[PDB]
């Protein structure tokens, strides 16, 4: 679990969105596993606007942060789950690191701010949904 709070927006994994997120829907994209809902309280998180390929992510299944080197956002094949059929997920960044399904939502950050959230994983792999291209999160 986990979310990003910036301005009047809450960014979460689309597969973990609540009834309240869908009732206050701003934008969603199944192909990216992202959903953004509106909030009444002001968020203070900062979104990175950069091309960093190194950062630190929070891993809840270890209660620890880990440094990662990650690939540029791209279309990557993701095996079927109870949430989605087998498909290509877009804007996904892959890295070597520990992750379990419940780690989705953990923030990945670089020196410029929030880069994305955990969205997929594998055997010694962790994948992050990028949010740096969503310029409207700041206006
Ligand atoms: C044996 C567990 S594992 O295959 O290593 C593993 C580690 C980590 C994992 O998530 C961090 C997973 N689960 C997933 O990647 N997904 C399930 C939830 C929806 C995700 C999506 N964006 O489509 C895909 C499996
Ligand atoms: Zn950066």
Swiss-Prot record:
The lineage of its organism: Viruses, Riboviria, Orthornavirae, Pisuviricota, Pisoniviricetes. It catalyses: Selective cleavage of Tyr-|-Gly bond in the picornavirus polyprotein. It comes from Coxsackievirus A16 (strain G-10). This is Protease 2A. Coiled coil: none annotated. Zn(2+) 1 binds at residues 50, 52, 110, 112. It comes from the Viruses. Cysteine protease that cleaves viral polyprotein and specific host proteins. It is responsible for the autocatalytic cleavage between the P1 and P2 regions, which is the first cleavage occurring in the polyprotein. Also cleaves the host translation initiation factor EIF4G1, in order to shut down the capped cellular mRNA translation. Inhibits the host nucleus-cytoplasm protein and RNA trafficking by cleaving host members of the nuclear pores. Counteracts stress granule formation probably by antagonizing its assembly or promoting its dissassembly. Homodimer. The chain holds residues 869 to 1007 of 2193 of the full protein. The active site is at 15 (for protease 2a activity), 33 (for protease 2a activity), 104 (for protease 2a activity).
């Amino acid at each position: 679990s986990g979310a990003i709070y910036v301005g009047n927006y809450r960014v979460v994994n689309r597969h973990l969105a609540t009834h309240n997120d869908w009732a206050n829907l701003v934008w969603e994209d199944s192909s990216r596993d992202l959903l953004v809902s509106s909030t009444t309280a002001q968020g203070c998180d900062t979104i990175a606007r950069c091309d960093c390929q190194t950062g630190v992510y929070y891993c809840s299944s270890r209660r620890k942060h880990y440094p990662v080197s990650f690939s540029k956002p791209s279309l990557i094949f993701v095996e079927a789950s109870e949430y989605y059929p087998a498909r290509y997920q877009s804007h996904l960044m892959l890295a070597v690191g520990h992750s379990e399904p419940g780690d989705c939502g953990g923030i990945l950050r670089c020196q410029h701010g929030v880069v994305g959230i955990v969205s997929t994983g594998g055997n010694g792999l962790v994948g992050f949904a990028d949010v740096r291209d969503l310029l409207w999160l700041d206006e």
